[PDB]
Amino acid sequence: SFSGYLKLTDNVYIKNADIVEEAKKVKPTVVVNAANVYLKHGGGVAGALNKATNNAMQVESDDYIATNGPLKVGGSCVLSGHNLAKHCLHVVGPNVNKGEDIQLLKSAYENFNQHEVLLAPLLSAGIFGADPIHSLRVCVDTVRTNVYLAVFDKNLYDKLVSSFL
Ligand SMILES: C[C@H]1CNC[C@H](CO)C1
């Protein structure tokens, strides 16, 4: 039921869309969150997804952290998708603004391979500070399952499509 996506490869699709609106429309089995190790969904994609859940994502996340401790950079956990999806896969890409190793972006994308189909943002893009062109490249070269990428910014979406090798 994903509609309006441009096909980049055999398994990677892209659309200029607000991932919250896309999740509400599609109700995918998995929506990926651009999480941090503490699951503190303050801003960027995480802040927007959490706000769409009326903070239920944050309440669930705080209980998860209280039980399990923080995630690793490059790691993930599966939690509820609330009103957005069946599940939310919280994936921690490296935050270059915190000096985290950009080489961990491939490990972060490997989490997507545990799910046959996902709605996702570009990991480490936006407020995480990585080059979104590089994130898309790592995505296509790492993810083998079906990934539907939602890119919020039209100007960035156009740049990503027009520069895609
Ligand atoms: C598994 C269902 C979850 N919501 C959308 C799916 C259609 O691609 C069906």
User: What is the sign of the dihedral through the CA atoms of 43, 95, 137 and 31?
Assistant: negative
d(CA 85, CA 123): 18
Q: Which residues, including other chains, have CB under 8 Å from residue 55's CB and lie 6 or more apart?
A: none
Q: Resolution limit in angstroms?
A: 1.1
Pairing of strands 30-34, 87-91: parallel
Ligand 1 centroid, distance to 27 Cα (angstroms): 6
Q: Which domain holds residue 36?
A: 1-165
Q: Which residues, including other chains, have CB under 8 Å from residue 75's CB and lie 6 or more apart?
A: 37, 91, 92, 107, 108, 111
Measured by CA distance, the residue closest to atom 8 of ligand 1 is 1
Ligand 1 centroid, distance to 23 Cα (angstroms): 11
d(CA 148, CA 132): 15
The enclosing H or E element of 33 equals strand 30-34
Q: How many CB atoms lie within 10 A of CB 140?
A: 19
d(CA 64, CA 82): 15
Ligand 1 centroid, distance to 155 Cα (angstroms): 29
Structure-derived torsion over alpha carbons of residues 64, 68, 69, 71, reported in degrees to the nearest 10: -80
Quote the number of domains for the chain.
1
Alpha helices in the chain (DSSP H): 19-26, 44-52, 56-68, 104-110, 132-142, 154-163
Nearest to 93 by CA among 54, 63, 59, 131: 131
